[PDB]
From a paper:
One such pathway is the type VI secretion system (T6SS), which in many bacterial species functions to deliver antibacterial effector proteins from the cytoplasm directly into an adjacent bacterial cell via a one-step secretion event. In contrast, DUF1795 proteins, also known as effector-associated gene (Eag) chaperones, interact with so-called ‘evolved’ PAAR proteins in which the PAAR and toxin domains are found as a single polypeptide chain. Crystal structures of Eag chaperones in complex with the TMDs of cognate class I and class II effectors reveal the conformation of effector TMDs prior to their secretion and insertion into target cell membranes. Given that the Eag chaperone dimer creates a hydrophobic environment with complementary knob-hole interactions for its cognate effector TM helices, and interacts with TM helices via side chain to main chain hydrogen bonds, we conclude that Eag chaperones provide an environment that mimics transmembrane helical packing to stabilize prePAAR effector TMDs in the cytoplasm prior to effector export from the cell.
The structure of the EagT6 chaperone was previously solved as part of a structural genomics effort and we were additionally able to obtain a 2.60 Å co-crystal structure of this chaperone in complex with the N-terminal prePAAR and first TMD region of the class II effector Tse6 (Tse6NT). A comparison of the chaperone structures in their apo and effector-bound states shows that upon effector binding, both chaperones ‘grip’ the prePAAR-TMD region of their cognate effector in a claw-like manner. By contrast, Tse6NT exhibits a pseudosymmetric binding mode with EagT6. In this structure, two alpha-helices of Tse6 each occupy equivalent Eag binding pockets and run in the opposite direction to match the antiparallel arrangement of the EagT6 dimer. For example, A7 and A30 of Tse6 interact with equivalent sites in their respective chaperone protomers. These two helices, which consist of prePAAR and a TM helix, flank a central TM helix whose C-terminus extends into the solvent, likely indicating the location of the downstream PAAR domain in the full-length effector. By contrast, we were able to model the entire prePAAR motif of Tse6NT and in this case, the motif forms an alpha helix that binds the hydrophobic pocket of an EagT6 protomer. In this structure, the two conserved alanine residues of prePAAR make contact with the EagT6 chaperone, whereas the arginine, aspartate and histidine residues are solvent exposed. It should be noted that the modelled conformation of Tse6NT appears to be locked into place by crystal packing, suggesting that in solution Tse6’s prePAAR motif may exhibit significant conformational flexibility and can dissociate from EagT6 as is observed for the prePAAR motif of Rhs1. For example, I22 and I24 of EagT6 create a hydrophobic surface in the ‘palm’ of the claw, which is flanked on either side by symmetrical hydrophobic surfaces comprised of A62, L66, L98, F104, and I113.
Residue numbers in the entry:
A (entry chain C): 1 to 38, 41 to 59
B (entry chain A), C (entry chain B): 2 to 141
């Protein structure tokens, strides 16, 4: 478990910056889906990147 | 709210808003690279009819996904629930991604299944994807 | 290989890798701000014993989180499953973050619960968190 990411994720979602919070349904699913296909990472890492993707747009 | 997950049950206050995401990575196979299957929830629908909710989802996807291309719209049914199936593609860092997204009307939130692959690899993973969605039973 | 989620049942091939993350945003309450409650899985443990697995988690958290330092640790049993509870503190961009994390031994993957808040706000979110964990019933 990446404590780095669990902390980042838990922090981001607390402040309203989770993926499902900032973009529509279809988009959040699509962003999460791309992150997983793009490293030895896990679900946490994927959800974080989906939010960084969503934020840069 | 008693909340069930694959590995346990636990009670959740109703003031907690759910953003849970099930994620399955389809392993690489032969010529095809790895794909992803994701279950997400969306509680945005409010009072609009379902058919118009999907439209709001389409308009948002065309606006925010770069290189959006719609391939198919399917107004179908899943075990008594109105459903819409979306085949579209968008571009991520020069790579063409082929998406297959299902919106299943439910309260308090729409269930969304999203398969991400490449147009070339889609036919390879369509069997496994077809397997899962035909097995989906929304729970009361 | 049937997969159970709060809203449906479905068959998932075993070749697919589970990376699911349950996510809840805790509402602000009194002087305290919103918190998050996350359930993640980990298959890295392998054959190493829980204690040495839990051991390795702190070693990595202690080098990777700026300003790490450990407040508490429990060793408890949840319905026959060994569990360790950690209260530790770290700073992200100069603001104090507090984590309450429980590792529940299980296979094929260890269950992990993570509550994020601030040292100040932990007492205000603790009652609801206590509700959630006193009800967690693992499946056999």
């Amino acid at each position: 478990m990446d404590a780095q990411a669990a902390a980042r994720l838990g922090d981001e979602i607390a402040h309203g910056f989770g993926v499902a919070a900032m973009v529509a349904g279809a988009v959040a699913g699509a962003l999460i889906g791309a992150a997983v296909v793009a490293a030895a990472t896990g679900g946490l890492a994927a959800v974080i990147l989906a939010g960084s993707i969503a934020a840069g747009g | 709210t008693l909340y069930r997950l694959h590995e346990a049950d636990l009670e959740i206050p109703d003031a907690w808003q759910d953003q849970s995401i099930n994620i399955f990575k389809l392993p690489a196979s032969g010529p095809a690279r790895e794909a992803s299957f994701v279950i997400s929830r969306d509680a945005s629908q409010g009072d609009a009819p379902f058919a118009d909710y999907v439209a709001r989802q389409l308009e948002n996807a065309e606006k925010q996904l770069p290189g959006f291309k719609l391939h198919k719209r399917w107004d179908i049914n899943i075990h008594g629930h109105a459903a819409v199936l979306l085949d579209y593609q968008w571009q991520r860092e020069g790579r063409d991604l082929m998406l297959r997204q299902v919106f299943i009307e439910r309260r308090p939130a729409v269930l969304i299944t999203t398969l991400t692959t490449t147009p070339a690899d889609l036919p390879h993973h369509e069997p496994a994807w077809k397997q899962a969605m035909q097995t989906l039973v929304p729970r009361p």
